[PDB]
Design a binder for this molecule. Structure first.
Ligand SMILES: Cc1cc2nc3c(=O)[nH]c(=O)nc-3n(C[C@H](O)[C@H](O)[C@H](O)COP(=O)(O)O)c2cc1C
Ligand SMILES: Cc1cc2nc3c(=O)[nH]c(=O)nc-3n(C[C@H](O)[C@H](O)[C@H](O)COP(=O)(O)O)c2cc1C
Lengths: 201, 200
C-alpha cells in the first residue's frame, strides 16, 4: 500500500537542482535511519555529513561519480566501526544503566566483545558491510519520504577517504550517499520478475 | 509516515498461530526487491522455507533455534557469488524489451569485466552490503503488511545449502523469520543521533 508508494518514488538520483538541503532534514533522516536493526543491536555506523569538503571528496570518486559528488549539495559518507569490541563497549557506556540491566551491560562490555574476537577477517568484513546495507536502505527511504533525492555510490577510492574527511582509521568508509533535490524525471530501473528470484522449500 | 512504519518494526521472537498467506510473502518480496543494488546487479535469491523449517532450525545457534522452529515462515536470503553470471542473467531475462543496445552490452560485457577485477574480499563485501539493502526493505515491507520479522545472523552458513537444497553458487546471508507477533515489544536502544554524526 503506502510503503510500495515510498519505494516507487526512490530513484538513483544523478543530477541535482540548486535547492538547498536543510541540515534539520538531514539530521532527521539519519535519526529515522538508525532505527534500523543491526546484528546484536551493535549499530556499528558513523554518518559523516559533508557540506564543506565536497570538492575534495569528489576527487576520490570514479567516472561520473566525480560530477555527482561535486554537484550534490550534501554527501553523507557512511563509515562502519572496524573495532567491534569498542563498538559493543560504546553502546554500554553511552546507554548505561538507564537503558540496560546489569546483565545487558556485561553482555556489551564483556560477552559480546569476546564473541567478536573470534570472528575471521571475512566474518568481520561481511558483518560491517551487511549492517551498512541495512542502514543505508533506511536512510535513502527516510530522505525519499521527505521529498529528497539521493544516490548510493560505491565507486570511489576508499583508501583516501579517512584522510580527506579527517576521520579516525578505526572507521572504514562503506558508501557515499549523495543528497539533493532531483533535476530530472526518472523512470524505474529494471528488476527481475519476482518468481525468478524466489525458491520454495 | 515512514517514521511511524519504522516505530512498528521490532525484532520479533515469539509468534502467534495465525497463518502467513503465501501471497503476502510474495508481495513483500516483490516490494523488497525494488531496493537499489550496486550496478542494479540485484544479486539476491529469496528461499521461502515452509516445509524444511525443523531441519533449518538445527543450524541456528542458541536462542535462534527456537525462533526458526517456531516461525511459521523463514526466508533464507542468499546472494549470487557468480556476479558475471548474475550480470548476464539480468541481460538475458530483461532483454531488448527492457534494455537498449548499450545497456545490454554493459550487462553482458562491461560489468563481468569489472567484476573480474574485484579481490575476494571486495566480492564478499559487495554481496553482504547488497543483502543488507534488500533485507532492510523486506523487513519494512512485511511490517507495512502487519507482519512481524526478525533477522538472524547466528547460524551455521556451511550447511544451509545442503539442508535447503540450494546450489553452492548462492551463499546464505541471513535467515529472516516471518510471522505475526504474540507480545508487546518495546523499541531496543539506539545511540543518540548526535553521537553517530560528524560534520565535514
Ligand atoms: C544482521 C542482523 C543479525 C541478527 N542476528 C540475530 C541473531 O542471530 N539472533 C537473534 O536473536 N536476533 C538477531 N537479530 C536481531 C537483532 O538483535 C535486533 O534487530 C537488534 O537487537 C535491534 O533491535 P530491533 O530490531 O528491535 O530494532 C539480528 C539483526 C540483524 C539486523
Ligand atoms: C550499493 C550500491 C552501489 C552503487 N554504486 C554506484 C556507483 O558507483 N555509481 C553510480 O553512478 N551509481 C551507483 N549506485 C546506483 C545504482 O546504479 C542504482 O542504485 C541501481 O541501478 C538501481 O537503480 P534505482 O535505484 O534507480 O532503482 C549504487 C547503488 C547501490 C545501492
Amino acid at each position: 500500500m503506502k510503503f510500495l508508494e515510498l519505494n516507487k518514488k526512490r530513484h538513483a538520483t544523478k543530477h541535482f537542482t540548486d535547492k538547498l538541503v536543510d541540515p534539520k532534514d538531514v539530521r532527521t533522516a539519519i535519526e529515522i535511519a538508525t532505527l534500523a536493526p543491526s546484528a546484536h543491536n551493535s549499530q556499528p555506523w558513523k554518518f559523516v555529513v559533508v557540506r564543506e569538503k565536497n570538492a575534495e571528496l569528489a576527487k576520490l570518486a570514479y567516472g561520473s561519480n566525480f560530477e555527482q559528488v561535486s554537484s550534490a549539495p550534501v554527501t553523507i559518507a557512511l563509515f562502519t566501526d572496524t573495532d567491534l569490541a569498542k563498538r559493543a563497549r560504546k553502546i554500554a557506556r553511552v546507554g548505561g544503566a538507564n537503558n540496560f540491566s546489569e546483565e545487558q551491560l556485561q553482555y556489551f562490555m564483556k560477552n559480546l566483545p569476546a564473541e567478536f574476537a573470534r570472528y575471521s577477517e571475512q566474518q568481520v568484513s561481511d558483518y560491517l558491510a551487511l549492517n551498512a546495507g541495512l542502514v543505508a536502505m533506511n536512510l535513502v527511504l527516510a530522505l525519499t519520504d521527505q521529498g529528497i533525492g539521493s544516490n548510493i555510490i560505491l565507486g570511489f577510492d576508499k583508501s583516501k577517504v579517512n584522510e580527506v574527511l579527517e576521520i579516525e582509521d578505526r572507521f572504514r568508509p562503506e558508501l557515499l550517499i549523495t543528497v539533493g533535490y532531483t533535476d530530472e524525471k526518472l523512470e524505474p530501473s529494471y528488476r527481475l520478475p519476482v518468481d525468478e528470484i524466489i525458491e520454495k522449500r
